[PDB]
Copies of this chain bind each other. A is one copy, B any other.
Amino acid sequence: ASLKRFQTLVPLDHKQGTLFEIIGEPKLPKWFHVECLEDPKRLYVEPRLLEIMFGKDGEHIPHLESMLHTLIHVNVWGPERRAEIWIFGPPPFRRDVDRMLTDLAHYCRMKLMEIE
């Protein structure tokens, strides 16, 4: 990616496109299976939404990950480029977590335009 680094239970390196790698030797969550690292789902969001959706430095992401049983990885670049939220787990899960994050994004977008 490029770096703002967001919090998560398992920090990953975004190597290239679909390739992610676990950084160092973290204690993994009981529900997390290394195999899920193979096919993550990506969804785009504008960058300014990231900290509204996930809190400052993505501080609420470990809670969300615990609730969803999917890893969340955030890649962010310039203000002019779309951010990428990458989601990791069983495909039956990645689909509905995808709708949840889209629904959350819709909400945060409305609040953004109201708080201004």
Contacts and interface: CB of A to CB of B under 8 A. Distances in A.
Given A66-B104, A104-B63, A99 B92 contact: yes
Oligomer copy total:
2
A96 B96 contact: no
Give chain A's interface secondary structure class.
helix
Nearest to A67: B104
Contacts of A66: 103-104, 106-108
A92 B94 contact: yes
Give the residue among A90, A94, A106 with the most B Cβ atoms within 10 A: A94
Interface of A: 31, 53, 60, 63, 66-69, 90, 92-97, 99-101, 103-104, 106-108
